[PDB]
Design a protein around this ligand. Structure first.
Ligand SMILES: [Zn+2]
Length: 46
């Protein structure tokens, strides 16, 4: 999937917490979860 020519590429759904792009809207939201962390944790990237 996402087979094109321009390697660089580009996607509308991009995360700001870490900086990861996606080709799906839902995927972007389901991903940001890794930053939401509703429960209290220790080791966190950002
Ligand atoms: Zn992210």
């Amino acid at each position: 999937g996402s087979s094109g020519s321009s390697g660089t590429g580009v996607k509308p759904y991009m995360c700001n917490e870490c900086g990861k792009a996606f080709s799906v809207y839902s995927s972007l939201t389901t991903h940001q979860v890794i930053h939401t962390g509703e429960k209290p944790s220790g080791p966190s990237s950002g």
